[PDB]
Amino acid sequence: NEVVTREYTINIHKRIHGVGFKKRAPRALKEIRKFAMKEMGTPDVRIDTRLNKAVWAKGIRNVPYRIRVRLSRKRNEDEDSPNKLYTLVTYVPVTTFKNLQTVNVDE
Amino acid sequence: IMNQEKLAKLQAQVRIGGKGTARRKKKVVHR
Amino acid sequence: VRYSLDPENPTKSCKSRGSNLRVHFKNTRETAQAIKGMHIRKATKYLKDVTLQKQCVPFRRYNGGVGRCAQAKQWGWTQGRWPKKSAEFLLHMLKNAESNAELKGLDVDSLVIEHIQVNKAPKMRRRTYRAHGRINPYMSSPCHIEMILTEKE
């Protein structure tokens, strides 16, 4: 299919390790976008404002280590655009990250 | 009056911010 | 207007021109040398790749301090860059030339850039301020560009 939605967890700690203090949360946004692009094969990635707030929740340098996100590949078929598909990345609040798999989520 | 469809979308418009911000009171159009 | 190198058969050819264009003359010369002799489709996709930093233009004459890149090995050379403004200006000129070809009624799928030339335009003066109460020039280096495309397959 091509309108699929899945739930992943991202090791922000792994992808941000080594980055300076004033760059950790912007680089976390960049790595989330890059992760979404690699997973769904869509250069158009929109990040939910709630997700951005979750990443910036603890300031610019103390980004959360792991984050549970939902990638939703959706039709861009609304106007003349180079990409007919796009990925909306939303925030999934969880209480623990133990034993969380990448899971297909239905409608 | 309020039904389930009206309530579920009303929750969106009254929230104009995250936790700890005042709720929207009204949005009235009048010509 | 008088181009240099008028085409041998000015019925299978189309022309494009631009004057006092606000791009750097050295970068534009290198990019024009890169795209010279190409097919029009190849040149268009190559300039788009240069904008996307997937193919470079080799800097052969104006290469003082230009860094090295892996994409320069496609060319027989070592120093290359990705002039975005030069690529976009030549893309606009290529679209204009293709529209001229459509107007002259010759199919735009067999066009080859046989002539492309970049001249220096009159410089434009700006002012910069130096250490001890001194004024120094801040000139721009615009360029004229011309190109003649020709049908051959």
Binding site: - | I16, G20, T21, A22, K25, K26, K27, V28, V29, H30 | -
Partner: protein, 63 residues
Amino acid sequence: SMLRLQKRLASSVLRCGKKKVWLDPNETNEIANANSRQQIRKLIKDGLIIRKPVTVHSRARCR
């Protein structure tokens, strides 16, 4: 399209700073139609312009 004038007028009418002026991000065209303090007052009455509350600075810890 560019609501600098509307934010300034709303601040002047609401007697607050431009920090506390909230313009509806959805009714941008309707707010942009407002070019007078009367129209700003009408928008405030209609709820398209809202004065945000003062940021909480609690003295409970000090007490």
